[PDB]
Every structure is written in structure tokens, then in C-alpha cells.
Amino acid sequence: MKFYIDDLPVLFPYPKIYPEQYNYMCDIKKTLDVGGNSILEMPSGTGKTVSLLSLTIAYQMHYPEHRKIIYCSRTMSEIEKALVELENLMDYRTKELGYQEDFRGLGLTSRKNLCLHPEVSKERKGTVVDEKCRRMTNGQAKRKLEEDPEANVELCEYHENLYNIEVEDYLPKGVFSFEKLLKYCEEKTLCPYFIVRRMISLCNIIIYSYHYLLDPKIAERVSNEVSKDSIVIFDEAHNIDNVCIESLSLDLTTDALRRATRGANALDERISEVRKVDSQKLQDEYEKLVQGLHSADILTDQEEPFVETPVLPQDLLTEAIPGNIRRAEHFVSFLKRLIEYLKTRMKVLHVISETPKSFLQHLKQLTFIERKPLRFCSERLSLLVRTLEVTEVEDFTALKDIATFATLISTYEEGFLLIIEPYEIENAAVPNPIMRFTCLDASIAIKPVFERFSSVIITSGTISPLDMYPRMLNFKTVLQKSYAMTLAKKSFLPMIITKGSDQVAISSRFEIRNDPSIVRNYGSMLVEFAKITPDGMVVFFPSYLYMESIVSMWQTMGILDEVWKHKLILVETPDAQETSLALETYRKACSNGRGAILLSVARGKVSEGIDFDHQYGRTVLMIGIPFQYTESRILKARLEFMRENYRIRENDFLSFDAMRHAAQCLGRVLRGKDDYGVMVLADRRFSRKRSQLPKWIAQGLSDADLNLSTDMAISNTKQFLRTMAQPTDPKDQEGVSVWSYEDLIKHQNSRK
Amino acid sequence: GGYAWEDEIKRSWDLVKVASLVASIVEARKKRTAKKNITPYQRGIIRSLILTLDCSEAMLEKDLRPNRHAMIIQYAIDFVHEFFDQNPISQMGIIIMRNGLAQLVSQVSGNPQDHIDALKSIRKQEPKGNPSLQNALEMARGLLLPVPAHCTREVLIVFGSLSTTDPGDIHQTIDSLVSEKIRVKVLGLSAQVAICKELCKATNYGDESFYKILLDETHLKELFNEAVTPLPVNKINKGFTLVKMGFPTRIFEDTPTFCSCHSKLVYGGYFCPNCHSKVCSLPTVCPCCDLMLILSTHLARSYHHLMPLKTFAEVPTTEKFRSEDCFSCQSRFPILLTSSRYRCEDCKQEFCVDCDVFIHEILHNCPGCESKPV
Ligand code: SF4
Ligand SMILES: [Zn+2]
Ligand SMILES: [Zn+2]
Ligand SMILES: [Zn+2]
Ligand SMILES: [Zn+2]
């Protein structure tokens, strides 16, 4: 349809529209017009991506500013979904407007997902792919080939072919999804990875993950290309704090330090070899360093620094190199003794928690390394590696971690904490000391985003409570509200089971994981629900270890045998590819009527973007509250930091952290208002957590379902499933849950 | 932490404490609105149905008295009697699903008695094993292969399980069914099944109203009954043609003679007008010349499906009325402020509530319309 807002014409790609979408669209426009940040929570059963793209894209095309749009997701899978939705809108707009307006939309991901090279795309890790692509695209091969054609160094045909054409002609006007982009590039032998990166500045809407916006290692390059007045959208940002924290975190192990020493020795040997034969390169680099130039000046735009910057760009010193690490040999000695200091600190016998300031003071005591040279460690190492002709960097890879540690610890002093534990795994014959550099304040990584950009929209399906996020992340919002879906007939049945058929309490507490009574009760619940669930049944466990243990007990007890009769069993695995294969098989079984049951982790890869709409998801079995591991040094330190700074109680945050993951999994079963399913939370502790659930889920949770039994819950599930199968009366939903064009005009007139 | 005992007493006696004629009509008025939409849709009178029944472990449940198997078989016997009564010139086939296999229990034939005997025998065996839609659909596809192009190939499936185990790819079978122009109706028992919904939708030109799930035993009888009526044909699916069939003449002989169909001595039979061979009963295909033999009564049974009687619209009490008694039965209309008169627009004659149901359910001609001379 094509309806009107106060002054903005927006073309919706569907003939019908939900009341929630119009209200959601109206609120977004007001936020953009008034400027500022907002937190909008909408039910997962109503089209959110289409509504966001429809209004935002219409907003830029109409207003003179023509503000660009920045869409941020949490995983690459969501990027493709948004792009497909993005393609849907433009196709509809092109048909309605009679012409294809000038519009460019691209997604941005890593080389691993966009490498068409037959030999470089067959790797099992993105780090190796980047190194090989850089070798063929750094420019050393091209320069060597130009000087001497006989050189055996190879190039990438896809990268070379781009130089023939101009940047503006890399792709035709329109929206190119990853599936479409690869097909188009393959037919013309071009590199999608370089096409998108060189084309970000020309895209009306650019879609990437949170890591490309929060992680300084890869954010700085992309952030420099995007505009400053563009619209920023945070989709599914209910776990944005975790992304922010991990952006400035590091872990060091005894093996890493041992490998670092080998790399340091190799660098010293290489420097000696270069000195004997080619000493002019060292002098040229030294002369530039004395002047005061940094990696940005020396390095060409075609090449990239060896060590990605680990700190935010605003925290990088703009002064010259301190001088202690100005020369190659002196820097190596500086680097070497730093590694030795780290090694001796790993021989502790008890957990030691220390602030960065204390660590620096002790370092300045045992050795004579000052704070300022450490801040330049990563910057200096990249220059040295660049000038040493290091075509193979397998040995020097370990030194990247050491350089990252030095810059991070010497840069930040507040909101960061260093943990040294003699036992990485408490259940180990021999101690395995580990050193963890942790970020406690999640607002540090997101602070630049909220200041650089004027308008930011934070939206998700299960972002509740909305007050905590402004508290946890230091920002203020013009408006924050949650919508309640106006569904004529209830489509989702949320229930809480506090005990089994025997009436014995059931919980997923780790200390009682190996309990015959609790395990059997959960297994009976799993079997009983599989009996009545028509097509698909998804089960989420608090942790992978709990799933591994409980599943094994079920196999011995014979519970899995009963499940095998009615549904195929697919289990999430640590290997990403195997889990993806399981999802394909799980979907195939549901489609063909064989029936399948998927066992996954509530905090795993499946829960972070994979949706089970319609037949795939009909019953969600939440086995316990997905609580974190309480006896963790990282979590305890963060809890204390939040308590002292933001006055957030430790118990409150723990409940909030677990509930958001439980709700996250709950909301991955509804796509439209015709989708239905049953959501069961199996733990005695969910009973008092009704107020903590999202508003649209709490509304559907009745008082009688606060504490149910396995037998009682099954009876309700059977009755609910039977009712949902009946033909819905159209008149019951003509203008109360779905609106036509005429109905929308009525709403506008009545409100005005 | 006090228990519920100390709180108070339930006091059940407190719960209970100590226009109507208009309500009875408005419900009747609303119900007449639902049936007001009647149009002469084209229907395929000649049908070829393959009744598929589920006999698996899931059919041993006690949801339906006495069990799903017994009730479904019991209703199946009822379905055969009603189907052939209103579709005399159609044929039926019966298949069952047992032990993950499709078992043929009745070949395609126009004799209702043969099907009844097969269903009665099935009533004894205990169901078990897993169901297999692909096995049943493949068998149904084969059974419908030797059918003329003018007949409507249909398959009614009574599914009771929530899962299906198949040896091959079900989607390929669904595609073949669409290519063969077979139409599938599924009557589920417990809940929607993803494959069943796709089968009913893609096989019926996208219509999603052919996959029905009951809510009680009363509704199940309605679902079975609704399938007896011929299914309207699609516009773009044209198979118009002329079918050669004859009208035999009954005889009354003094001595018995062998029948050309069963090779059995029978006193009286109908002589085919093409080869003079005698057949015990009708309607059946002649065993010699392969020419369908039917009586004029059989054709007349389907006229009402081609010229449905237009619904009767209520008359508001504001206007005056013609007569105080029903035109057809002269049943005095109660005064009751509401009216019970139903008028036929074609003839504008008042009818009582009793006749209106009878005229549109038992009879198929408006008594007033016939009396009216043009
Ligand atoms: S230029 Fe593109 S195709 Fe070639 S190796 Fe690099 S990422 Fe792969
Ligand atoms: Zn005979
Ligand atoms: Zn004959
Ligand atoms: Zn009457
Ligand atoms: Zn009449």
C-alpha cells in the first residue's frame, strides 16, 4: 500500500498492515524528526524489518537531507535477511513509482564469506584467508612483478580486474544481497569483498554487524567511510553489552607467551639478516619515525597494518615515537623483556585481581618499561613488520597478542581489570595458568557511536526492561516504549512448569545436574511434548556442558529411545559447519512431516539469529533459566563494577542477564500473526519472573500458568494446538489485528 | 507461610444466587446470512474417490469413544451409504495404512455393498505400526490411473498421527499428484501437520480450506458428511466431453439365467441396449461392451447440484404479510415483536421455518414456484 504520514509518503510492500507496524513506524519518524536516541520494543510476531526499512528509506528519499541509513545486526545471517527484505521494498517501489530510483544497498562481511579465489577460499579460519588475500593484494607482488616479470609471486585475478573499471561502475544501481552479489561477481570475475568496501561511501544504506561498529580492530576503517548524519539502526540489540565488552578484552596463556618468545627470536634473526644485506630499509623507516610520522602516513591505502589497533581511535596518542622503541633492535629488546615479565607473572599460586595502574607500576619496578612506549607497541610493531619483507608471517602471528596486550593495558585504567588465575580449568591434573584482560564498563566501546551519530534507533523483539539499557550504557533516549500486539485470538501459549508429573520440583541448577529425579522429570517432559508437537520442537539448555551431561543420562536411562519413535534428534555441536548441517536436516524433517527435535544451548549459535517460524517452531522447551556461571572471576568483577558505579544489584543483573536470553529464544518462533506455538519455561524459578519477561510475552502469560505441572501443561498444549488448527473467522480480525488501506485512513482521521 | 486451610472457607453456596424470544430469531437471522451466498457453481458429478484411512498406533488413543479406529471405521460405513446415495454414478476405492505400508481393501467399483463388506472386516483387526502418506498416495495414484478424463479424481485421507515415515521424497509425490490432476482432502484428528497442509493446498490450486481438523465427535460427523457433495471444478481445468452410456430396460423372466457380470443364476436383470447382456444391478459398466448403464433416476439425483434453489430471505416485521398460514403446510405462524415468515423472491410466497429447512434439505423445488404459471 501507499499511505501518508504527517508529511512523509511511505510505500509499504504489502496490501495489508498491522496496527503495531503503523504505530511503530509513526514513533520511528518522530524520533528521527526530533533527533536523539530511542528504544522501541515490538513483538516478534509482527513484521519489524520491513516496517523499519519502509519508513527509513522513504524518509531519506523524500526529505532534502537525504540522510543515509546504517543498519546494524548481530550476525551475518541477519544481514542476508535484512537485505532480502531490503530487496523486497525496492522492487515494490520500482513497480509503484514506474522507475528504478538511484539507490545502492550492500552488506559488509569478512573475506571468508566473500572470497571467490579457488585456492584461498578453501580455509577453515578467516585469519589465514586474510593473510593470503593480503599477500596477493598488499601491492608487494604487483610492484615486484612490474620490476621483474620473471617473479613467481602470484596475484588475484578478481582483485586485478577491478582496476580496469571505475569504482562507481563496480555494481549496477540496486540492492545486492550476498547470494546475488556472489553470483554477479562470479560471472564477471570480481572480488565482492573489495567491491563493497570501496563502495560503502556510495551506498544509501549499508548493513553490517555490531563488530564492524563497536570493535576498534575493524570498525575504524569502515567507520571512516560512513557519513556522520546517517540514520543508525540497532536491530536485535538486547545483547549489545556483550559485544561491547568483548571488543576490548584479551586472554593470554602460557602457550601464547611461549610462542611469543619464538616469534621475538625470529624477528631478531630476521633483522640481522636484513641488516647484513639490505640496511637502507631500516634507515629509511628510522628517518621517517624521527620526523614524527605514524602508520597512517607511511602505510599506503592499499595496505593495512600488521597489528589492528586494539584501542579506540580517540585514545591513540598523536605524538611521535618515544624513542626507546625507535630502532628495530631496541624495540625487539623492549618487546622481548616485556614477554619475559609476562611469563614470570603467570607462575602465581592464587587468583590475583589487579588494576592496569598497579600492573604498570610493578612492570616499571621489575623492569624499566614506561607507560608511553607500551601505548605505541602495536603501532611500532606494524611498521617494523612492514619494512622487514615478512611475506610469511606464521611465526610472527603470536606477537600480535603481545602487542595488543601492551596497548590495551597502557591505554585504559578505569573500567578495565586484569585477572591472573593459576587454573584455567579447575578440573585439570596440572595447573594451566591464564591471564585475562577484561573490560567491565560496556559503555566505553559504544561511547564514540552515541556521540558521532545524532539519531540512533535501538530496536529488538525482547529488549526489556528498557530502563536498564540506558543505565548500563551511558546514553539518554527521547522516548522508550514497548508495543502490545493486538491479536484477535491468542496465537502463543506461554506457560511455566515448576514441577513434574510426580509433583517434585525441577530446576537446572548446575550443582544438581546429575540428579536422577530431576533428570527423569525433564526427560519425561521432553518425551511427552514430542508426542503432541506436530512438526517441530526446539529445546534450549542453559549451557552446553549441562546439555552434554543430561543428554548422556537420557541415553543411558532409555529416554532418547522413546523420542526417536516420534521425531528425529538433532543436537548442536561446537563445530559451526556441523550445527549448520543439523539445522538443514532439522528443517527438512519438519517440512516433509517426519518430525524433528532440536537440542541447542540457550546461549549458543542457534539462539543468536536462527528463527523457527511456522512448522519449524511449534514448541519451545526452556530447560531452566540460562544463568551464567556464577563462580567466574570475569562475571564477579563485572557485577561489582556495575554495583559500585551504576548502582545495579548483583542479583538483579544476573536475573536480567538470564531472562533476556530466555526471552530471546522465546521470540524466535513467531513471524506473522497466523503463526502459533507453545512456550514452556521449565523451572521452579521462572514462577516469580513473569514481570521480568517482555511485555508482549508477560501479557499472554496467565496467572493460572505461573506454576503448572508436566501433566497439566500437556493437557493445555493439546487443547491449545487443537483450537489453533481451526479456520479463523475473517470477521474477527478484519479491522482489529490487520488493517487495509481504508482502515488505516480511519485510524488517522479518528486520531486527528 | 500459612496454608489455604487457614485463609477462609470456599462457601460454594455464595457463588449461586437467585427479548429472549428476539434472541432466538436473531440467531436464525444471522444463520440465514451465512447460507445466503449460493451460486450455481460448476460441479463434477461423476467422481472417483479413493478413501484412505489411518490404522496405526496413534489410532489406539482413547480420545474418541471407544477408540479412534472403531469410530473412524464406524463413520466410514456411514460415509459409504451416504456417498453412493447422492452420487449413484460414481465409484469409490478404500485404502488403509498399516505397518508403514498401504494395503488395498477395495478396488474402484460402483457397488456400495462391496465396500461395506471390506470396511466391516477391517473393523476387527487391531491397528498398529506407523503411517505412510507416500505409500498411500502412491497406491491411490495408481488406482486412479485407469479412470476416464471426464471423471473427477479425488482422495479423502483420514489422518490421525502427527508424524509420517516415508521411504522416498514426499514432495515428489505431491508434484506427481498435481500433474495427474488428483485432488486431496485431509481430515486430521489431533493437530495440523506441515506436509498435510502443503498437500491439501498445492493440490487444490492453493486453497487452504480442504485441510480440516475436528474439535469433537459431533463436528467429525459434519466433516465426513460435507465430503459427500461434489467438489466444484476449477475454471482453467477444462475437461468437457460427451460420455457414451445407455438406458437398459428391466425384464421379468420366468426362469433363472446366468448373469454376464458374475456368471451366477439370477431371476431378473437389466438388458444392455448395445449387446443384450444382462446385469444384476445398476449403475455398473457393462461387462461386455464397456458401456455404462444407468437409469433416468440416477441422472435426476444430481439436478439439484446444477440448479440449486436460491436461499430464502427473512421478511422484516415492518411490512405487512400476505397470509397467516404457511403456503405449503398451512402451519399457523406464532405471533410471538418478531416474524418467522420466510419468503422466496422468485414467487414471493411465505414459508414457515419448518418447510424452509425441509425444502432446502429434502426437497429441491420451491412449492410456490412450481404452482406459479408464467
Ligand atoms: S582479493 Fe577477494 S577473491 Fe582474491 S583472495 Fe582476496 S578476498 Fe579472495
Ligand atoms: Zn451378476
Ligand atoms: Zn453391453
Ligand atoms: Zn410450512
Ligand atoms: Zn419460490
Side-chain angles (χ1 to χ4, degrees):
Chain A
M1 55 161 86
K2 179 189 91 154
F3 61 95
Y4 266 95
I5 317 179
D6 300 319
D7 70 320
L8 177 46
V10 62
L11 288 85
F12 207 57
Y14 295 99
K16 287 188 228 149
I17 194 176
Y18 293 135
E20 293 73 50
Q21 292 171 303
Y22 178 78
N23 284 272
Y24 183 52
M25 263 189 279
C26 277
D27 278 317
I28 295 159
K29 184 179 171 297
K30 292 185 175 71
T31 308
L32 297 195
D33 291 331
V34 182
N37 316 310
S38 71
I39 300 166
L40 303 179
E41 190 277 331
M42 197 166 70
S44 310
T46 56
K48 184 187 67 164
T49 303
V50 68
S51 298
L52 276 157
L53 298 186
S54 289
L55 179 79
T56 55
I57 296 166
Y59 189 95
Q60 65 182 354
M61 292 294 174
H62 182 234
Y63 282 56
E65 295 300 320
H66 282 246
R67 302 178 63 193
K68 302 177 177 296
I69 295 159
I70 288 162
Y71 207 99
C72 309
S73 52
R74 59 182 309 178
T75 57
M76 187 226 76
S77 56
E78 308 283 327
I79 299 187
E80 181 64 14
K81 294 200 208 78
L83 277 177
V84 172
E85 284 282 68
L86 183 57
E87 290 176 350
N88 179 1
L89 184 68
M90 306 327 297
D91 290 356
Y92 179 80
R93 292 181 63 91
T94 303
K95 187 208 76 63
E96 287 272 336
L97 294 174
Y99 65 99
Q100 185 172 355
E101 62 206 276
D102 279 9
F103 183 75
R104 293 188 176 287
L106 296 176
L108 174 50
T109 179
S110 86
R111 286 159 155 122
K112 177 66 173 284
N113 309 312
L114 294 173
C115 193
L116 297 171
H117 197 274
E119 211 60 40
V120 170
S121 58
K122 297 193 299 194
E123 317 293 2
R124 288 306 315 147
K125 53 204 79 60
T127 44
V128 171
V129 176
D130 278 33
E131 292 174 350
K132 291 184 182 293
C133 166
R134 270 166 207 144
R135 205 184 325 168
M136 270 187 287
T137 65
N138 180 2
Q140 297 294 109
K142 203 162 150 171
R143 192 169 72 251
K144 289 170 71 173
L145 185 66
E146 288 174 349
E147 296 310 322
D148 288 345
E150 189 52 281
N152 60 355
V153 70
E154 294 179 353
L155 300 177
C156 190
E157 49 174 28
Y158 300 84
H159 181 249
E160 280 297 298
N161 290 1
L162 286 164
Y163 276 115
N164 302 310
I165 55 172
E166 270 62 36
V167 65
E168 180 58 295
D169 299 354
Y170 279 7
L171 299 171
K173 302 276 186 195
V175 186
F176 270 97
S177 61
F178 287 138
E179 183 178 2
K180 183 186 175 110
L181 182 63
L182 295 177
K183 273 177 49 47
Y184 183 77
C185 290
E186 177 54 31
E187 294 293 328
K188 293 184 183 294
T189 317
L190 307 170
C191 177
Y193 172 71
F194 276 109
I195 283 161
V196 301
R197 281 192 80 67
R198 293 179 212 194
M199 200 161 173
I200 291 166
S201 65
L202 284 154
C203 295
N204 294 91
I205 178 163
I206 189 75
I207 307 174
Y208 44 85
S209 52
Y210 291 148
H211 285 255
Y212 275 97
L213 192 78
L214 275 294
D215 188 50
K217 300 191 204 67
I218 54 167
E220 68 175 340
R221 275 285 325 288
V222 173
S223 193
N224 193 1
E225 312 286 349
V226 309
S227 88
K228 56 183 287 293
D229 290 345
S230 51
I231 310 291
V232 184
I233 301 158
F234 288 176
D235 195 358
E236 302 300 315
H238 55 280
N239 293 117
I240 199 173
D241 60 353
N242 303 123
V243 183
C244 293
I245 294 284
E246 66 183 342
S247 282
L248 310 160
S249 280
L250 173 75
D251 268 2
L252 287 175
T253 59
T254 310
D255 196 350
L257 303 174
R258 213 187 43 72
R259 215 181 292 110
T261 56
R262 272 274 319 294
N265 294 128
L267 269 183
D268 187 17
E269 180 144 309
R270 175 47 173 187
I271 290 161
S272 199
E273 293 161 16
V274 169
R275 179 71 66 190
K276 285 187 180 64
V277 305
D278 192 326
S279 66
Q280 180 53 31
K281 213 74 69 168
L282 277 295
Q283 193 63 231
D284 191 359
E285 186 207 64
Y286 177 76
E287 181 48 41
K288 286 140 94 174
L289 286 179
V290 172
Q291 293 297 108
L293 285 67
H294 306 119
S295 280
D297 301 359
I298 295 89
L299 276 66
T300 46
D301 55 3
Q302 186 174 347
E303 62 184 335
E304 295 177 353
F306 180 60
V307 191
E308 299 90 340
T309 186
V311 296
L312 277 296
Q314 63 182 20
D315 304 311
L316 184 63
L317 296 192
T318 43
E319 71 178 70
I321 305 291
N324 302 303
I325 55 175
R326 204 169 271 181
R327 286 171 62 83
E329 289 84 354
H330 303 341
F331 172 60
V332 164
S333 66
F334 174 94
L335 185 60
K336 262 195 270 194
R337 66 171 174 271
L338 173 71
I339 293 162
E340 293 305 329
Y341 174 80
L342 269 296
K343 277 204 281 180
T344 183
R345 289 282 266 154
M346 292 261 291
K347 293 190 291 186
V348 298
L349 303 167
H350 50 58
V351 300
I352 295 169
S353 180
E354 290 179 353
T355 69
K357 184 192 273 223
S358 59
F359 180 94
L360 283 174
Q361 184 179 2
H362 199 239
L363 172 78
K364 185 176 173 66
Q365 186 192 20
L366 277 295
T367 178
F368 305 92
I369 292 164
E370 286 79 359
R371 188 184 173 195
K372 179 138 74 73
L374 294 171
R375 301 180 79 163
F376 285 100
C377 188
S378 81
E379 186 275 337
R380 181 67 185 90
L381 184 56
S382 64
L383 280 155
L384 172 72
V385 173
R386 195 199 93 71
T387 63
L388 279 190
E389 187 175 2
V390 296
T391 181
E392 65 184 1
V393 298
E394 270 288 5
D395 290 345
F396 311 140
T397 188
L399 270 180
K400 264 141 76 191
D401 289 278
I402 307 307
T404 311
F405 181 76
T407 308
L408 287 171
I409 195 159
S410 52
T411 296
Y412 303 112
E413 82 184 296
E414 296 302 320
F416 288 76
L417 185 64
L418 182 68
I419 318 299
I420 317 182
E421 308 158 72
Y423 293 91
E424 186 185 342
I425 302 295
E426 63 186 342
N427 182 77
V430 302
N432 199 336
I434 189 167
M435 185 183 290
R436 318 174 165 278
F437 188 67
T438 317
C439 185
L440 311 178
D441 200 344
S443 60
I444 301 295
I446 208 166
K447 184 68 71 176
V449 176
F450 277 118
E451 186 176 2
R452 186 186 182 162
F453 304 108
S454 66
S455 296
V456 183
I457 305 301
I458 298 166
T459 184
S460 161
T462 55
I463 183 167
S464 87
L466 286 77
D467 273 19
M468 184 94 62
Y469 286 86
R471 218 197 306 287
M472 179 162 56
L473 305 173
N474 283 354
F475 70 96
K476 66 186 289 184
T477 61
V478 301
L479 62 92
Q480 55 187 2
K481 50 167 60 179
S482 48
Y483 306 90
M485 60 190 294
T486 305
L487 78 174
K489 71 184 187 304
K490 73 180 318 180
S491 85
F492 60 99
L493 174 64
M495 306 183 313
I496 306 182
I497 296 166
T498 58
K499 59 197 181 294
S501 66
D502 52 16
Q503 306 268 307
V504 177
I506 58 176
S507 66
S508 80
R509 216 182 318 152
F510 199 67
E511 65 182 342
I512 61 172
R513 60 210 270 276
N514 292 14
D515 196 290
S517 68
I518 303 289
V519 171
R520 205 179 266 289
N521 268 331
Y522 272 127
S524 188
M525 186 182 291
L526 182 71
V527 162
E528 286 295 87
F529 271 103
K531 297 282 229 293
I532 62 179
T533 307
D535 295 302
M537 199 197 149
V538 295
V539 189
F540 292 103
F541 293 79
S543 64
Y544 190 75
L545 193 57
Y546 192 93
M547 183 198 83
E548 265 188 348
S549 83
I550 197 160
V551 167
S552 296
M553 267 169 280
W554 287 343
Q555 189 274 330
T556 300
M557 295 174 73
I559 292 152
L560 292 189
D561 295 350
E562 202 156 3
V563 178
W564 268 115
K565 313 293 181 281
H566 307 279
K567 286 171 151 45
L568 302 193
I569 300 176
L570 278 297
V571 189
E572 171 176 312
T573 49
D575 192 324
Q577 294 192 143
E578 282 172 39
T579 313
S580 308
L581 262 69
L583 287 183
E584 183 84 20
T585 310
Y586 168 80
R587 285 184 166 205
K588 274 176 187 171
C590 291
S591 296
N592 60 36
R594 179 59 184 273
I597 197 162
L598 180 68
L599 315 171
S600 296
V601 177
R603 318 177 80 96
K605 312 167 280 289
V606 175
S607 71
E608 63 180 1
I610 299 299
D611 69 331
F612 314 80
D613 61 356
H614 292 84
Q615 69 285 0
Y616 309 132
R618 292 294 198 204
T619 294
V620 173
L621 177 42
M622 204 71 39
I623 294 166
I625 310 177
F627 272 114
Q628 290 184 357
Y629 183 43
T630 59
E631 293 311 89
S632 178
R633 309 293 320 166
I634 299 299
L635 180 57
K636 289 183 285 185
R638 189 187 177 191
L639 289 162
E640 293 164 10
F641 182 84
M642 271 192 219
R643 195 261 306 285
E644 294 177 350
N645 293 265
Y646 307 134
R647 303 201 69 67
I648 299 155
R649 314 179 56 268
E650 292 94 335
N651 263 23
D652 282 31
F653 181 75
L654 273 159
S655 84
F656 156 76
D657 201 36
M659 287 301 319
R660 79 211 281 204
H661 281 84
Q664 164 191 9
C665 284
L666 288 187
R668 303 282 202 290
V669 298
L670 306 172
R671 186 181 296 279
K673 285 192 186 179
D674 54 14
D675 208 328
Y676 58 93
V678 293
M679 315 209 275
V680 296
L681 304 164
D683 204 329
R684 185 184 78 267
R685 303 177 275 178
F686 285 105
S687 45
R688 286 210 281 108
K689 312 265 185 189
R690 161 155 155 254
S691 178
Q692 312 213 35
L693 280 157
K695 204 182 70 160
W696 66 275
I697 306 184
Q699 183 178 2
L701 183 56
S702 283
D703 307 65
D705 303 359
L706 279 179
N707 50 354
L708 295 159
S709 179
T710 300
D711 56 355
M712 280 196 325
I714 285 287
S715 86
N716 293 347
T717 304
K718 284 174 68 179
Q719 180 52 286
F720 167 86
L721 285 169
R722 184 179 294 281
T723 304
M724 295 300 323
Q726 304 298 303
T728 309
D729 290 345
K731 266 50 176 160
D732 208 297
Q733 65 178 51
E734 280 293 329
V736 294
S737 66
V738 75
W739 284 352
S740 74
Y741 182 70
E742 292 84 3
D743 291 331
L744 186 65
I745 298 294
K746 296 274 175 190
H747 181 80
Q748 305 216 47
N749 293 128
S750 86
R751 274 183 56 234
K752 206 159 72 185
Chain B
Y3 301 93
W5 302 297
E6 308 178 350
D7 296 338
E8 281 199 353
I9 283 159
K10 300 176 179 182
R11 288 190 182 174
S12 65
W13 68 84
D14 288 348
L15 293 170
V16 175
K17 295 177 178 180
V18 176
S20 84
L21 304 164
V22 190
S24 66
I25 297 290
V26 296
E27 296 323 280
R29 304 291 202 71
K30 291 289 287 186
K31 290 292 278 195
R32 291 264 157 212
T33 317
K35 63 169 71 178
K36 260 170 207 179
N37 57 93
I38 305 290
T39 182
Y41 280 146
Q42 196 183 301
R43 298 175 193 280
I45 304 298
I46 305 188
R47 321 175 68 196
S48 298
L49 280 70
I50 305 287
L51 177 66
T52 313
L53 300 191
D54 182 27
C55 299
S56 299
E57 305 275 39
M59 297 299 290
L60 294 172
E61 272 185 60
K62 307 291 208 65
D63 193 338
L64 280 299
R65 297 292 182 192
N67 58 1
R68 288 170 161 180
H69 185 269
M71 162 160 284
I72 290 300
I73 296 299
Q74 185 64 59
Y75 271 116
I77 302 177
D78 188 3
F79 177 80
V80 177
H81 287 87
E82 269 157 49
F83 172 88
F84 273 110
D85 190 359
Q86 295 207 137
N87 290 316
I89 59 172
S90 304
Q91 51 196 2
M92 182 179 288
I94 306 190
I95 299 164
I96 60 167
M97 300 140 68
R98 272 261 316 292
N99 289 311
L101 297 173
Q103 195 90 319
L104 177 57
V105 296
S106 308
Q107 282 283 13
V108 285
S109 65
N111 189 354
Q113 209 63 34
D114 189 359
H115 302 309
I116 300 301
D117 185 75
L119 270 165
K120 284 186 180 304
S121 66
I122 289 166
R123 196 163 42 188
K124 277 106 178 166
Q125 66 179 359
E126 181 81 342
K128 67 184 289 295
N130 293 273
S132 179
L133 288 178
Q134 205 194 20
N135 274 342
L137 288 173
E138 291 277 296
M139 182 166 286
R141 174 181 210 291
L143 289 189
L144 277 155
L145 181 64
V147 176
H150 60 82
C151 310
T152 313
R153 297 180 259 209
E154 293 179 353
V155 178
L156 186 66
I157 312 177
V158 176
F159 204 53
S161 181
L162 294 156
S163 173
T164 309
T165 59
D166 309 86
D169 190 74
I170 186 69
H171 291 273
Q172 302 281 36
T173 309
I174 296 174
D175 266 10
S176 72
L177 289 167
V178 175
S179 158
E180 190 48 285
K181 295 182 183 292
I182 307 180
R183 301 192 68 171
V184 176
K185 263 173 72 79
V186 176
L187 299 175
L189 290 191
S190 64
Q192 284 183 359
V193 188
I195 191 66
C196 284
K197 192 190 188 70
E198 186 185 308
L199 173 66
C200 280
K201 187 182 172 292
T203 304
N204 289 252
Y205 315 111
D207 205 350
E208 274 188 10
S209 46
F210 297 110
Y211 185 27
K212 297 295 200 189
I213 308 297
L214 75 165
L215 61 92
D216 57 7
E217 63 87 19
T218 56
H219 191 195
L220 180 60
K221 186 177 180 180
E222 185 177 2
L223 294 200
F224 264 109
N225 191 358
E226 181 260 350
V228 307
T229 77
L231 188 66
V233 64
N234 189 358
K235 196 193 279 292
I236 58 169
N237 197 350
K238 70 199 184 60
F240 304 166
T241 187
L242 291 167
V243 299
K244 196 175 180 181
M245 56 181 60
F247 304 151
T249 302
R250 193 153 212 190
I251 209 165
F252 285 130
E253 195 54 49
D254 289 345
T255 61
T257 52
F258 291 102
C259 68
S260 182
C261 66
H262 315 123
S263 302
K264 181 173 71 173
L265 293 173
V266 166
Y267 279 114
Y270 299 70
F271 277 68
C272 170
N274 192 237
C275 59
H276 285 225
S277 62
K278 69 179 281 179
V279 300
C280 302
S281 76
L282 284 89
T284 80
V285 300
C286 194
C288 304
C289 60
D290 278 28
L291 182 85
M292 182 158 292
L293 310 162
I294 65 167
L295 302 185
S296 179
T297 51
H298 295 148
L299 299 171
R301 199 82 183 84
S302 290
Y303 280 146
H304 67 84
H305 281 136
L306 316 177
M307 299 183 289
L309 200 47
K310 291 186 86 83
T311 180
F312 290 178
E314 67 279 5
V315 300
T317 188
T318 302
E319 53 170 9
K320 77 188 307 187
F321 314 110
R322 302 174 60 80
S323 159
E324 297 177 353
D325 47 28
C326 196
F327 183 92
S328 63
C329 78
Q330 64 175 359
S331 186
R332 284 197 75 262
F333 301 161
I335 306 299
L336 212 65
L337 176 60
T338 306
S339 178
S340 68
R341 289 157 174 86
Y342 300 81
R343 180 180 291 178
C344 178
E345 62 185 0
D346 284 28
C347 57
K348 295 204 141 301
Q349 299 272 17
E350 270 84 21
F351 295 119
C352 81
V353 63
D354 191 0
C355 294
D356 186 342
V357 167
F358 170 82
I359 297 297
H360 290 245
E361 185 64 13
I362 305 301
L363 273 174
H364 291 304
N365 50 359
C366 178
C369 289
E370 297 301 319
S371 294
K372 183 171 73 171
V374 184

